[PDB]
Structure formats: structure tokens, C-alpha cells
Amino acid sequence: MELTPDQQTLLHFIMDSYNKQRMPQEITNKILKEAFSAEENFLILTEMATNHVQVLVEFTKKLPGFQTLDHEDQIALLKGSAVEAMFLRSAEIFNKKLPSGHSDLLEARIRNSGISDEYITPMFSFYKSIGELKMTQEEYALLTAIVILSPDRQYIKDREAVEKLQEPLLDVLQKLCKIHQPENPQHFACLLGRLTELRTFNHHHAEMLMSWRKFTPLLCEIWD
Amino acid sequence: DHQLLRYLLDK
Numbered sequence: 001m002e003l004t005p006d007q008q009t010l011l012h013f014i015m016d017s018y019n020k021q022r023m024p025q026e027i028t029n030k031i032l033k034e035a036f037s038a039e040e041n042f043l044i045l046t047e048m049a050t051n052h053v054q055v056l057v058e059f060t061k062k063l064p065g066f067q068t069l070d071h072e073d074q075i076a077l078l079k080g081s082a083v084e085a086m087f088l089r090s091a092e093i094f095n096k097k098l099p100s101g102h103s104d105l106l107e108a109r110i111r112n113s114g115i116s117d118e119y120i121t122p123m124f125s126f127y128k129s130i131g132e133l134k135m136t137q138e139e140y141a142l143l144t145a146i147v148i149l150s151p152d153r154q155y156i157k158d159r160e161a162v163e164k165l166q167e168p169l170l171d172v173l174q175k176l177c178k179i180h181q182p183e184n185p186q187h188f189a190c191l192l193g194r195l196t197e198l199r200t201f202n203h204h205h206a207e208m209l210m211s212w213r214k215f216t217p218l219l220c221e222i223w224d
Numbered sequence: 225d226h227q228l229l230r231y232l233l234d235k
């Protein structure tokens with residue numbers, strides 16, 4: 001079992017766009033040096049969330065066919081996926097990119113940022129759940145593309161156009177599960193389990209934003 | 225509306 005040359009080409013474009021992300025030194029240094037107070041911890045999180053929006057747009061722009069979509073549909077997809085894409089990238093950075101000590105300090109900062117356990121608990125439950133699947137880089141990149149190119153987001157005018165871009169990605173992901181995990185037929189079902197779990201963050205994030213009187217004007221406009 | 229996303233998308 002192998003990917004077709006067309007599938008290999010689609011995957012390469014996705015992987016290339018995904019591998020561009022790299023946490024800048026200034027943010028990493030802040031996690032280490034800043035005072036351990038609710039306001040300093042929250043500011044670090046806000047900067048990370050803001051930087052992710054820029055990272056998300058750059059990744060999305062290079063997804064095959066994205067630039068062929070109507071301008072308003074490009075905006076609707078970005079707005080619709082911003083929270084889910086953020087948590088998925090977070091799961092990867094917490095479980096793979098940051099060193100043990102830095103991730104331990106970032107978790108300490110997240111847990112002492114003035115954010116309620118109602119939102120912190122499902123967040124860390126999700127990271128552990130993603131960690132269990134021992135996802136490859138190809139799995140992270142494809143899952144991110146599938147999340148972004150979701151045809152059922154609100155305010156999309158040409159859904160059929162989005163469906164034509166999403167279906168080949170789901171096909172590639174299922175085929176990689178059959179190639180790399182043939183002894184584990186439930187592997188693709190497990191990856192799907194993460195897509196639905198990611199959707200639950202849309203509510204948790206919306207409630208968290210309405211709870212502010214901490215107030216970050218820029219992020220509130222992107223997430224509505 | 226969506227002024228930041230519009231700018232990032234054009235850049």
C-alpha cells in the first residue's frame with residue numbers, strides 16, 4: 001500500500017507549510033524569565049495566542065486550493081477554525097516541541113493565569129488524549145488542514161468548493177493509517193475522536209471570553 | 225469587519 005503521486009504531492013505541500021512554524025526565542029525566554037504573577041502569566045498566553053493567529057494564516061494560505069476560494073469564504077474558514085487550530089497546535093507544542101522544564105513552567109503559568117479550572121481541565125485532558133495517539137508530524141499537519149478546511153463552518157457561501165478540498169485530505173489521512181498502522185484498524189477512528197473533542201473548545205473559549213471585564217480587545221474581534 | 229484577518233491574508 002502506497003500513496004499515489006498526486007496524494008504524495010498534496011501531502012508534501014501540507015507538510016512543507018506545517019514545518020515552517022517555529023516558536024520565536026523572545027516568547028520562549030518570557031516563559032523562563034517573567035515574574036510568576038497572574039497578570040504576567042496571562043500576558044505571555046495572550047502573546048502566544050496572538051502569534052498563533054499569524055502562524056495559522058500563513059499555514060492556511062499555502063494549503064492547496066485555499067487561494068482558489070472566494071475571499072469571504074477564506075475569511076469564514078479562518079474565523080471558524082482559529083480556536084480549534086490553536087488547541088491542536090498547542091497539543092503538539094506541549095507534548096513535542098517544548099523541553100520538559102519549559103513545558104512544566106508553561107503549565108505552571110497556564111494554571112496560575114487567572115483562568116478558571118472549567119477551561120484548564122478539558123485543555124490538559126485534551127493534551128494527554130492527543131499524547132496517547134503518538135501522532136506523527138504528517139498526522140498533525142493533515143489534521144490541522146482538515147480542521148481548517150471544514151465545509152460546515154458558519155457563513156461559507158460555496159460549501160461544495162470547501163468539500164472538494166477537504167475530502168482528498170481525509171482520503172490521504174485514512175491511507176496513511178492503513179500503511180503505517182495496519183495492525184491497528186481503529187487508528188483512523190481515534191484521529192476522528194480528536195476532531196469532535198476539538199469542537200468542544202469553541203464553547204469553552206466563547207464562555208471564557210464573555211467572562212472578562214485580562215480584557216484583550218484584539219483577540220475578542222478575531223474569535224467574536 | 226475582520227480587518228486583521230483581511231490584512232494577514234493579503235500579506
Ligand SMILES: O=C1N(Cc2ccc(-c3nnn[nH]3)cc2)c2ccc(Br)cc2C12CCN(S(=O)(=O)c1cccs1)CC2
Pocket residue numbers: 021022023024045046047048049051052055086087089090091093094106107110219
Ligand atoms: O495559543 C497557544 N499555543 C499555540 C501557539 C502556537 C504557535 C505560536 C507561535 N508564535 N510564533 N511562532 N509560533 C504561539 C502559540 C500554545 C502552545 C502550547 C501551550 Br502549553 C499553550 C499554548 C496556547 C493555548 C491557548 N492559550 S490560552 O491560555 O487558552 C489563551 C490565552 C488568551 C487567549 S486564549 C494561549 C497559549
